[PDB]
Amino acid sequence: RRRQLIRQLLERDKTPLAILFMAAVVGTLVGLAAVAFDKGVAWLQNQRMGALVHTADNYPLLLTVAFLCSAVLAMFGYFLVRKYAPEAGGSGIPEIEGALEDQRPVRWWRVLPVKFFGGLGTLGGGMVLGRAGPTVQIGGNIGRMVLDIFRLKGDEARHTLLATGAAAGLAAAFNAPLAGILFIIEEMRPQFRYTLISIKAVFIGVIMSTIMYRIFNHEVALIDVGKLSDAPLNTLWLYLILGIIFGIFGPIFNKWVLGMQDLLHRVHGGNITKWVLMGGAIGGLCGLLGFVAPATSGGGFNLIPIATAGNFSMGMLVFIFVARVITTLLCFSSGAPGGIFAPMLALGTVLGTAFGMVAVELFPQYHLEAGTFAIAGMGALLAASIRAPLTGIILVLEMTDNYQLILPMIITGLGATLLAQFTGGKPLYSAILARTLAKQEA
Amino acid sequence: DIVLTQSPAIMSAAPGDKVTMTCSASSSVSYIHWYQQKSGTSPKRWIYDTSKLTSGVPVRFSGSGSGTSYSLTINTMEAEDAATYYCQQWSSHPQTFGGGTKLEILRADAAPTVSIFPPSSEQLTSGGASVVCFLNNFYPKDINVKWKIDGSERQNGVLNSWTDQDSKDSTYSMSSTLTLTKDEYERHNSYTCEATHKTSTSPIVKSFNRA
Amino acid sequence: EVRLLESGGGLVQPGGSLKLSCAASGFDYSRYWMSWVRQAPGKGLKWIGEINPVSSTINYTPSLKDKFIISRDNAKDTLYLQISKVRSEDTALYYCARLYYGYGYWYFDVWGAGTTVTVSSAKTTPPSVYPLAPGSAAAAASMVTLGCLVKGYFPEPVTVTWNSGSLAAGVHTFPAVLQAALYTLSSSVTVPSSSWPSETVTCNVAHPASSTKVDKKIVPRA
């Protein structure tokens, strides 16, 4: 087949000018959509905060209006999903992943309204859920919509605009261009055969998406964490160890999120009303915990700067990790719209911090700043639960700009994904798509 | 904590000649460092991580070792190589230095240029009498000074002080001062100062009579 | 250039306290760890302690609750060491150091010149400076040794130069000796017979601890 290759090599990277242009517009819409969703999630979290001010004298009334405001929003968003788009529940990444396999529908007229307004319900109530799941589906569907609206035919155009839709949607969720591309190249692309996704296109969409984000968000960063110390070659081994703790814990957590999906189905059966009443109670729990114990509630980003700075007692860190392991599962496994990636950044920061504290006390000759181990553990659960180490490493790199930590970050990531593999664990997105495709047959 | 014990406390070697001092650890130690101190100069980092030189450290310098014994070495020693070399471990915590190794130039033996001085008329008006005797520019440093007041030995009230090996000629020096009251000074007449070196059996006496 | 300049040492009375100060110039003094090492007279090097750039971890040698207080002022680019309940054991040269590493085993990267701390209830005394001319019937040789004596001052140090510094060859200042809570030392200058007494050779003693600047002209005896 040497002659075919001479032919193909000479024809490489000639993406149709139409697919490039349409990737640009997908990028722009996904960016704008991201900002809009972002501004809304906050504005509701504000209204909720200001409510607790107009009634701040009477502490039971306090605990009540906290619970109920989030209960109401939770329900609305569960309902919005159960009623009009049940595949807009949970993450959204397995769905868009499935769609790239040509095995799941891009019901965009149904997901865009349901996912956007459903998330707003669950996110803005202070549930323990992320943006970057929803925005990855919301941006995947936007990518489909402009395929239909302009009726572009071709296999390339369908996988591409779905891919750059999803790419732009993660980039905008974390202000993380390089990390949005890599997610598609490492995790979302079909994993077992060739596919015809144009990478130059995906590049254009993320640029446009990111630039929309910078037009509505500049001067303020998602995680400011300073410049931390360096890492000495004789320190590296401490990170491979930290990795091996994530590699074992990642699959334990995957089990948990699956079984807790199974356990929480037995509570409502499928019954849209026991479901919507169940999310209202979960959401309200968040909205209450959001007041009496905010580290235990919410999306988690807020406390990443604080754990990294080593400003939590060991005692408070251990609390938070358990508590948020609980509220994380309760909120994501229940089926609400919203995701687990960004709260897995929090759980890993909190975990690596606590190791950093141990590792500082045990080795004064190393001159450790427990903050480097927080940065090494931030992308770690992403390497162990969802097995995309290259994305998290570059995700974390982009969000914390501490490139001197690249070797400990890499070394903890291999540790996470080597031990996650070696103790019998599966990519958490892929094990969700499959258990969903297995029900889409039984 | 970890005690480091540098071995040849003092030593000499001629220029262009092989120098080798030693460090030794009460427990086990990794990647030792070495500092070069001249008197009056900030201690300089010389050799780190058991073997890596520092920007400027000439290549004649080299360090070695493992586990519980380390070592510095100067393949061809120079004159400017005269200093004290401290080793230091931070392989454990807290970090400890060794006692040191003073590396002094070696040269030809040389006889003292002896000089003796009478209490100044200025010191005498104030009532003290200090007699000063200089042994200037010799090698090696071992030496003995004797005082004789009217040809009789005097042991009490004498203070001596050697210089550190000289820069230019790598010789020594050493002064002796006999201090009496102005009254004790005048009872006597001949003050003698006797240099007992290695470079002769016959001391270099210098002396003066008040007359 | 990278410069570490510690100041603040001197004479202090037993049981008192002092605050030494190391000023950094020529590098980002943030991002570096700083440390203190002291050298007791003719003794080993010894580590006092270290402070990390943000002042969130401060180590000291195994020694007494509040005995040392290391702290840093990154705005002022300056490091500080406080010694309290000062003993004679604490009489030493105090060295200020910047910390780094290689393969990660940490070393003492750049040192300062030092400051000396003397702990004595003895009182500051200026020096009496006496010319040393050759004996009345002097053995006039080719080279002639002159001198001058710096007697009874406290504390160390004195600086002795000859003809305001021109005569630099053949000068030999000797370690001061302490007696009865006072210091004496003397300085030899050897010049050629044609320089003295043909020209004037002077010795200049300075004891700044007591504001003593004196010139003693050497002139022949009788």
- Cα–Cα dist B180/A234, whole Å: 65
Q: Tell me how far apart the 2 most distant CA atoms of chain C are, in Å.
A: 72
Range 337-366 of A in CB contact (< 8 A) with B: 363-365
Which residue, of B107, B122, B154, is where some domain finishes?
B107
SS (H, E, C) chain B: CCCECCCCCEEEECCCCCEEEEEEECCCCCCCEEEEECCCCCCEEEEECCCEECCCCCCCEEEEEECCEEEEEECCCCCCCCEEEEEEECCCCCCEECCCCEEEECCCCECCEEEEECCCHHHHHCCEEEEEEEEEEEECCCCEEEEEECCEEECCCEEEEECCCCCCCCCEEEEEEEEEEHHHHHHCCEEEEEEECCCCCCCEEEEEECC
* Chain B, chain C: beta-carbon pairs less than 8 Å apart: 140
Q: Are strands C11-12 and C3-7 parallel, antiparallel or unpaired?
A: unpaired
CB A300 within 8 A of CB A347: yes
Task: Give the resolution to one decimal, in Å.
Answer: 3.1
In this structure, what DSSP letter does residue C146 have?
E
Which residue has tokens 């000796």? C177
Distance between CA atoms of residues A306 and A308, nearest Å: 5
Q: Are B88 and C108 within 8 A, CB to CB?
A: yes
A307 in Cβ contact with A104 (< 8 Å):
no
What is the phi-psi region of residue C164: left when phi exceeds 0, alpha when psi lies from -120 to 50, beta otherwise? left
- Who contacts A295 (Cβ-Cβ below 8 Å, separation ≥6)? A303, A316, A319, A320, A323, A324
Interatomic CA distance for residues A122 and A287, integer angstroms: 10
Calculate the dihedral angle through the C-alpha atoms of A346, A348, A352, A354, rounding to the nearest 10 degrees. 60
Q: Provide, as residue numbers in chain A, all residues whose Cβ is less than 8 Å from the Cβ of B95.
A: 365
Write down the residue that tokens 């190393």 correspond to.
A366
- Which chain C residues touch B95 with a CB distance below 8 Å? 47, 106
**Cβ contact (<8 Å) for A365 and C106?**
yes
Domain tally, chain B:
2
Q: How far is CA B181 from each of CA A307, B119, B131, B134, rounded to the nearest angstrom? A: 75, 11, 11, 21
* Token pair listed for A300: 């988690």
Q: Which of B86, B107, B128 is the last residue of a domain?
A: B107
Distance CA B65, CA B53 (A): 14
Domain final residue pick, B79, B107, B135: B107
End-to-end CA distance of chain A: 43
C-alpha to C-alpha distances, A42 to A46, A77, A119, A345, nearest whole angstrom: 6, 16, 12, 20
Which residues does a gap of C–N over 2.5 Å follow in chain B? Answer: none
- A174 alpha-carbon distance from chain centroid: 9
Domain range holding B90? Answer: 1-107
Provide CB contacts within 8 A for C209, sequence distance 6+: C10, C11, C124, C153, C154, C155, C157
Distance, CA of B19 to chain centre: 18
Interstrand relation of C45-51 and C58-60 (parallel, antiparallel or unpaired):
antiparallel
Q: Given CB atoms, is B90 within the 8 Å cutoff of chain A?
A: yes
Q: Is B180 on the interface with C (CB under 8 A)?
A: no
E-strand ranges in C26-67 read 33-39, 45-51, 58-60
Strand partners, C145: C190
Report the alpha-carbon distance of residue C11 to residue C85 in Å, rounded: 14
Tokens of A262: 């199974």
Tell me whether A270 touches chain B (CB under 8 Å).
no
Q: Would you call B9 an interface residue with chain C, using a CB distance cutoff of 8 Å? A: no
Q: How many C-beta atoms lie closer than 10 Å to residue C70's C-beta?
A: 20
Q: What residues form DSSP beta bridges with B204?
A: B195
Structural tokens at position C198: 């043909």
Distance separating alpha carbons of residues A274 and A82, to the nearest angstrom: 11
Same domain, B43 and B139: no
C79 - beta bridge partners? C22, C72
Closest residue, chain A, to B96 (C-alpha): A365
Q: How far apart are CA A368 and CA A356, in angstroms?
A: 8
- What is the spatial distance between Cα A328 and Cα A90, in angstroms, rounded to a whole number? 12
| Interatomic CA distance for residues A135 and A128, integer angstroms | 16
On whether the CB atoms of residues A26 and A165 are closer than 8 A, the answer is: yes
Which residues in chain A have Cβ-Cβ distances shorter than 8 Å to B90? Answer: 365
Chain C residues closer than 8 Å to A364 by CB: 59
A40-70 per-residue burial string, b: 16 or more CB within 10 A, e: under 16: bbeebbeebeeebeeeeeeeeebeebbbbbb
Strand partners, C179: C182
Which neighbouring-strand residues pair with B34? B47, B87
Query: Which of chain C's residues have a Cβ under 8 Å away from the Cβ of B86?
Result: 44-45
Q: Are B179 and B87 in contact (CB under 8 A)?
A: no
User: Which of these, A244, A238, A256, A253, lies nearest to A417 by C-alpha position?
Assistant: A244
Integer CA distances (angstroms), A204 to A37, A87, A158, A207, A331, in order: 22, 28, 16, 5, 34
Query: Are B2 and B100 in a shared domain?
Result: yes
What does each C-alpha distance from B8 to A397, B19, B85 come to in angstroms? 52, 11, 11
Strands C11-12, C115-119: pairing is parallel
Q: Do B95 and A365 touch (CB under 8 A)?
A: yes
For residues B123 and B36, state if they share a domain. Answer: no
Determine contact, residues B23/B81, Cβ cutoff 8 Å: no
Q: What is the extent of the structural domain holding A281?
A: 1-442
- Whether residue B13 contacts residue B60, with contact meaning beta carbons closer than 8 Å, is answered with no
Please answer yes or no on whether B90 and A364 come within 8 Å at the CB atom.
Answer: no
Return phi, psi of residue C146, to 5°: -105, -170
Residue ranges of chain C assigned to CATH 2.60.40.10? 122-220
The token pair at A382 is 């992403």
Structure tokens at B179: 């201090």
Of all residues in chain B, the one with the smallest CA distance to A363 is B93
How far, in whole angstroms, is CA A148 from its chain's centroid?
27
| B176 and B125 housed in the same domain | yes
Cis peptide before B140 (omega within 30 of 0): yes
The Cβ-side half-sphere exposure at C116, using a 13 Å CA radius, reads: 10
Strand segments (E) across C68-141: 68-73, 78-83, 92-100, 107-111, 115-119, 128-132
Q: Are residues B66 and B133 in the same domain?
A: no
Co-location of B68 and B149 in the same domain = no
Element (H, E) at A38: helix A17-51
CA-based R_g, chain B, Å: 23
Cα separation, C138 vs C26, whole angstroms: 55
Which residue shows structure tokens 């405001």? Answer: A69
The domain covering C122-220 belongs, at the CATH homologous superfamily level, to Immunoglobulins (2.60.40.10)
Tally of domains within chain A = 1
Q: Report the CATH number at residue B61.
A: 2.60.40.10
Same domain, yes or no: B76 and B129: no
Distances (CA, A) of C170 to B69, B159, C40, C189: 43, 22, 30, 6
Asked if residue B154 and residue B74 are part of one domain, the reply reads: no
User: Are C104 and A234 within 8 A, CB to CB?
Assistant: yes
Best CA proximity match to C155, nearest among C217, C202, C88, C216: C88
